[PDB]
Specification:
By secondary structure, the chain is α/β, with parallel strands linked by helices. It has a single domain, classed as TIM Barrel (Alpha-Beta Barrel), CATH 3.20.20.70. Helix content is 37%, strand content 16%. Strand 8, helix 6 and strand 9 form a beta-alpha-beta unit. Helix 5 packs parallel to helix 6, helix 6 runs parallel beside helix 7 and helix 9 packs across helix 11. The radius of gyration is 18 Å and the shape is globular. The termini are far apart. The chain binds flavin mononucleotide, the ligand CCc1oc(=O)c(Cc2c(O)c(CC=C(C)C)c(O)c(C(C)=O)c2O)c(O)c1C and orotic acid.
Length: 350
């Protein structure tokens, strides 16, 4: 996969994963790694971040890889092609990636039928501690962003353990302004009303996924709206449009969202701030630059109940999943935690 262009390599990775051609992971999850949050049991706290399986093609292969939960998407209401290629760039010297896909999506109807073909299989997986998240986006030309998200709630909500209102892609014009207070309250009120209108066994948790580039005011406002409306959780963070000092990759000045190691601590600090602003009462899924057990535990101690990764998988391969989990269990023991749950937010209680 490293030898092809990055997008072609990704498509080959998705196809290979979907076929199950990867040997089943050998790491057996210990009880120490179980987390109960968002109304569900998670066998382990390490998920695949949105973007790897944009269209829901490889869910079962990803569980076989050892992920404790899978998030697909972002999915847009209508199919759309995204930006012209190339739109994904490797920064090997930084263990980073820059992408500007622009919400390439098979669309709600195609993804709906894909998930329906395995809906009862997923119900059993969820009951066994392996939940499914669905990340919702908006079409490029849509005139009414809230209605795009409402359509996603109605169509894929009934197939999801949790939904993500992705208002933080750097690659759709105007999207991140949906993170402002008034716009976000109106958008999330509509999303939650649509969610509440689904039948009980088809009613997912709703989370908001936020950028790492927010001002202090932006974060205060998001925290306020999340508590006012009863939003079920936050995903922290998407990719960054910043370019931290010190990037070495030749492609560092490509337009797009930066992921991987240069994002890691910006993400951890955003988790830390959002946990404090919500008094530790709002579950956080922490994501950005996780490639080791230490990376995972730092985000958990900062306030994350669960973590996700994507970019590290494309540098270290499938073994990184078991590596993170084994290192995490060892660090929890070394630091005197009974399990993941005991470590959530621990830095704030020092
Ligand atoms: C190529 C690529 C595509 C992505 N697509 C999406 C997406 O469609 N929706 C979304 O919410 N996040 C998307 N992300 C963001 C990731 O879910 C994650 O938030 C971010 O990459 C940081 O995690 P990482 O450093 O482990 O990759 C994408 C990231 C990458 C690298
Ligand atoms: C869009 C971001 C992006 O997404 C990808 O999916 C890949 C492919 C890829 C990979 O998925 C895995 C993980 C292997 C699986 C079978 C799932 C890899 O181990 C590698 C390598 C070199 O080891 C790999 O290149 C990318 O290169 C990039 C830049
Ligand atoms: O371009 C996309 O589709 C995309 C990239 C990214 O980093 N984040 C996101 O939410 N969408």
């Amino acid at each position: 996969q490293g030898l092809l262009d990055p997008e072609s390599a990704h498509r080959l990775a998705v196809r290979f994963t979907s076929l199950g051609l990867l040997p089943r992971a050998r790491f057996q999850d210990s009880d120490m790694l179980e987390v109960r949050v968002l109304g569900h049991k998670f066998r382990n706290p390490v998920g695949i971040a949105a973007g790897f399986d944009k269209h829901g093609e490889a869910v079962d292969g990803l569980y076989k890889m050892g992920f404790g939960f899978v998030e697909i998407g972002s999915v847009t209401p209508k199919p759309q092609e995204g930006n012209p290629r190339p739109r994904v760039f490797r920064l090997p010297e930084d263990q980073a990636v820059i992408n500007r896909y622009g919400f390439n999506s098979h669309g709600l109807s195609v993804v709906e039928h894909r998930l329906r073909a395995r809906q009862q299989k997923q119900a059993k997986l969820t009951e066994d501690g392996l939940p499914l998240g669905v990340n919702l986006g908006k079409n490029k030309t849509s005139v009414d962003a809230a209605e795009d998200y409402a359509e996603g709630v109605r169509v894929l909500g009934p197939l999801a353990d949790y939904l993500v209102v992705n208002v933080s892609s750097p690659n759709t014009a105007g999207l991140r302004s949906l993170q402002g207070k008034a716009e976000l309250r109106r958008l999330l009120t509509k999303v939650l009303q649509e969610r509440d209108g689904l039948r009980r066994v088809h009613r997912p948790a709703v989370l908001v996924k936020i950028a790492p580039d927010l001002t202090s005011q932006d974060k205060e406002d998001i925290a306020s709206v999340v508590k006012e409306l009863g939003i079920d959780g936050l995903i922290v963070t998407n990719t960054t449009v910043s370019r931290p000092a010190g990037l070495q990759g030749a492609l560092r000045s490509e337009t797009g969202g930066l992921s991987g190691k240069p994002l890691r601590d910006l993400s951890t600090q955003t988790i830390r701030e959002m946990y404090a602003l919500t008094q530790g009462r709002v579950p956080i899924i922490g994501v950005g630059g996780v490639s080791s057990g230490q990376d995972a535990l730092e985000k958990i101690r900062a306030g994350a109940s669960l973590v996700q990764l994507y970019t590290a998988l494309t540098f270290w391969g499938p073994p990184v999943v078991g590596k993170v989990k084994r290192e995490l269990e060892a660090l929890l023991k070394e630091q005197g935690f009974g399990g993941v749950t005991d470590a959530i937010g621990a830095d704030h209680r020092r």
